């Protein structure tokens, strides 16, 4: 654990990127987290919402 | 069936041509929720409950 100061920075950036990428799996109230499924299923009046 | 004792026909393992039902003149109400009626033939579902 001697080089913890540098490892902590690497870990914080890795966690930040993993968190950002994992947010793409969230629905945020939408019917699906996948944009392609929404566009494949819905027409613009509902797809835009 | 009566609405209180409505029938359910599970539909699976088949090809579903939805253009016949949508473009029919015999239907007055045809309202789709969650999908659009003109994209139905491009979709796949695990199961359909009629």
Curated annotation (Swiss-Prot), chain A:
Residues forming coiled coils: 7-49
Annotated consequence of substituting residue 40 to A: In strain: Alpha/B.1.1.7
Outcome of mutating residue 8 to N: In strain: Delta/B.1.617.2, Mu/B.1.621
Tree of life domain: Viruses
Annotated function: Subunit of the fusion protein that is processed upon entry into the host cell. Mediates fusion of the virion and cellular membranes by functioning as a class I viral fusion protein. Contains a viral fusion peptide that is unmasked after S2 cleavage. This cleavage can occur at the cell membrane by host TMPRSS2 or during endocytosis by host CSTL. In either case, this triggers an extensive and irreversible conformational change that leads to fusion of the viral envelope with the cellular cytoplasmic membrane, releasing viral genomic RNA into the host cell cytoplasm.
Name of this chain's protein: Spike protein S2'
Gene from which this protein is expressed: S
UniProtKB/Swiss-Prot annotation, chain B:
Assembly with partners or alone: Binds to host ACE2. RBD also interacts with the N-linked glycan on 'Asn-90' of ACE2. Cleavage of S generates a polybasic C-terminal sequence on S1 that binds to host Neuropilin-1 (NRP1) and Neuropilin-2 (NRP2) receptors. Interacts with host integrin alpha-5/beta-1 (ITGA5:ITGB1) and with ACE2 in complex with integrin alpha-5/beta-1 (ITGA5:ITGB1). May interact via cytoplasmic c-terminus with M protein. May interact (via N-terminus) with host bilirubin and biliverdin, thereby preventing antibody binding to the SARS-CoV-2 spike NTD via an allosteric mechanism.
Domain of life: Viruses
Variant or mutagenesis effect after changing residue 29 to A: In strain: Omicron/BA.2, Omicron/BA.2.12.1, Omicron/BA.4, Omicron/BA.5, Omicron/BQ.1.1, Omicron/XBB.1.5, Omicron/EG.5.1
Annotated effect of mutating residue 28 to F: In strain: Omicron/BA.1, Omicron/BA.2, Omicron/BA.2.12.1, Omicron/BA.2.75, Omicron/BA.4, Omicron/BA.5, Omicron/BQ.1.1, Omicron/XBB.1.5, Omicron/EG.5.1
UniProt organism field: Severe acute respiratory syndrome coronavirus 2 (2019-nCoV)
Name of the protein: Spike protein S1
Task of the protein: Attaches the virion to the cell membrane by interacting with host receptor, initiating the infection. The major receptor is host ACE2. When S2/S2' has been cleaved, binding to the receptor triggers direct fusion at the cell membrane. When S2/S2' has not been cleaved, binding to the receptor results in internalization of the virus by endocytosis using host TFRC and GRM2 and leading to fusion of the virion membrane with the host endosomal membrane. Alternatively, may use NRP1/NRP2 and integrin as entry receptors.
Shown segment, full-protein numbering: 348 to 397 of 1273
């Amino acid at each position: 654990s001697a080089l913890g100061k540098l490892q902590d920075v690497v870990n914080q950036n890795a966690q930040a990127l993993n968190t950002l990428v994992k947010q793409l799996s969230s629905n945020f109230g939408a019917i699906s987290s996948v944009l392609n499924d929404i566009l494949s299923r819905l027409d613009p009046p509902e797809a835009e919402v | 069936a009566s609405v209180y004792a409505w029938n359910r026909k599970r539909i699976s393992n088949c090809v579903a041509d939805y253009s016949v039902l949508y473009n029919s003149a015999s239907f007055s109400t045809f309202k789709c929720y969650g999908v659009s009626p003109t994209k139905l033939n491009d979709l796949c579902f695990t199961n359909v409950y009629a």
